[PDB]
């Protein structure tokens, strides 16, 4: 819940210099096990790839685990990635792990969530389950 | 079938794209009153076989989603295209192109049309419409 | 800064409930030459529907006009998104200034990621390199 506005202060320096270039699915796995006659649980795990001494760019990944049950029916495990570029002015220091991880948990997450939501919708349809439309994140 | 068998042995599919789309939700759906739909397709082929050995199969669609018991809830008009080419020996005629479009063309494109309807209706926040699987004579 | 302040009283009491596409119109007018750079222009305008004496909820609509060209339009799209917000209130109704303020700030910001995913999806279907809109 409310620990999220601290993370926006810690990622603001980087947020002021970073730019989004691309989003992509990196991997997916999914299966239907049993008949739908529903509930679900969806877990996220953000992560960031960077090496701010070679490249001024980094990648935000969000790994998702979805479980669907009758009140398991189907499971999915997938990960999305967003590619960001940054530019440092004459003096500036490199982003630290703290700024990268905080930007990831905020701007990254909110930028990625629509794609996850759409993937979930499409996937449940292709599996012939009742289509699942995730709630909008606040 | 026969009229287009010759072009069917020599034609290869290359790509598929959406050409255009237009849609709007006008009113709330009412499943319990009874929700229904109309879907009109219009096929077309673009070719110029003396200059290029490539052709395009287009299917124009008109979707009308309606409350029964007959009020319109949403409407869409969109068109998909499929790009084919072939390796000849005599140029394909307008009949051959038309028959091929009506069979292989139409059935190649249909799954893209169905996926689009499913995606759109989800985005408009309507009950997701999943078109029927169309039978083809083997 | 300014509108953030005017919107903050409503911002502290409002919660997003749902986002949907209301309408769309798009066409690829001239196929892009493969891998030659594409540029875009996106124009947006927020609008808000509200009747605080009748209902303690409102809808923020962002209408979008997207033009894509080669670096003469390659593709265009005109579409509108809606976000439905619910609020809880001896506090006064929000005024038309607090609503418009919220809409052009928090409303736009909550909608923008969904506008990005739609543009990506739609440009990809048009057989263009999928476009990823810049950070707001």
């Amino acid at each position: 819940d409310a620990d999220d506005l601290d993370l926006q202060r810690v990622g603001a320096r980087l947020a002021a210099r970073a730019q989004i270039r691309d989003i992509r699915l990196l991997r997916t796995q999914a299966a239907v096990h049993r008949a739908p006659k529903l509930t679900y649980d969806l877990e996220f795990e953000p992560a960031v790839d960077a090496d701010p001494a070679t490249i001024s760019a980094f990648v935000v990944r969000i790994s998702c685990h979805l479980r669907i049950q009758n009140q398991d029916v189907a499971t999915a495990d997938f990960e999305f990635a967003a590619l960001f570029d940054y530019h440092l002015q004459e003096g500036e220091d490199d982003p630290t792990e703290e700024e990268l991880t905080a930007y990831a948990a905020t701007t990254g997450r909110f930028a990625l969530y629509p794609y996850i939501r759409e993937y979930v919708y499409d996937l449940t349809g292709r599996l012939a389950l009742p289509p699942l439309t995730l709630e909008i994140l606040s | 079938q026969r009229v287009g068998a010759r072009l069917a042995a020599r034609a290869q599919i290359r790509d598929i794209r959406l050409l255009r789309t237009q849609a709007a939700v006008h009113r709330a759906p009412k499943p319990a009153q009874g929700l229904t739909y109309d879907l009109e397709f219009e096929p077309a082929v673009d070719a110029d076989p003396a200059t290029i050995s490539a052709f395009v199969v287009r299917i124009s669609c008109h979707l009308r989603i309606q409350n029964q018991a007959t009020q319109d809830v949403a409407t869409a008009d969109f068109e998909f295209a499929a790009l084919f080419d072939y390796h000849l020996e005599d140029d394909p005629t307008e009949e051959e192109l038309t028959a091929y479009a009506a069979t292989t063309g139409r059935f190649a494109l249909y799954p893209y049309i169905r996926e689009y309807v499913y995606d759109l209706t989800g985005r408009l926040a309507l009950p997701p419409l999943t078109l029927e699987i169309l039978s083809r004579p083997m | 800064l300014d509108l953030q302040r005017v919107g903050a009283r409503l911002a502290a009491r409002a919660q997003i409930r749902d986002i949907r596409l209301l309408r769309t119109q798009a066409a690829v007018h001239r196929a892009p030459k493969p891998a030659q750079g594409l540029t875009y222009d996106l124009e947006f305008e927020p609008a808000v529907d509200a009747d605080p004496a009748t209902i303690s909820a409102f809808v923020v609509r962002i209408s979008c006009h997207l033009r894509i060209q080669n670096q003469q339009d390659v593709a265009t799209a005109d579409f509108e998104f809606a976000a439905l917000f619910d609020y809880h209130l001896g506090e006064d109704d929000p005024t038309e200034e607090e609503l418009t303020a919220y809409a052009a700030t928090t409303g736009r910001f909550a909608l923008y990621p969904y506008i990005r995913e739609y543009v990506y999806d739609l440009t990809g279907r048009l057989a263009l390199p999928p476009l990823t809109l810049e950070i707001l």
């Binding site: 529903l38 509930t39 009140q71 009742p130 | - | 949907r20 529907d49 809808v59």
Partner: peptide
């Protein structure tokens, strides 16, 4: 009218 809507779901 405030054009509100409700999306149906088979999920909880």
């Amino acid at each position: 009218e405030v054009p509100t809507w409700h999306r149906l779901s088979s999920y909880r």
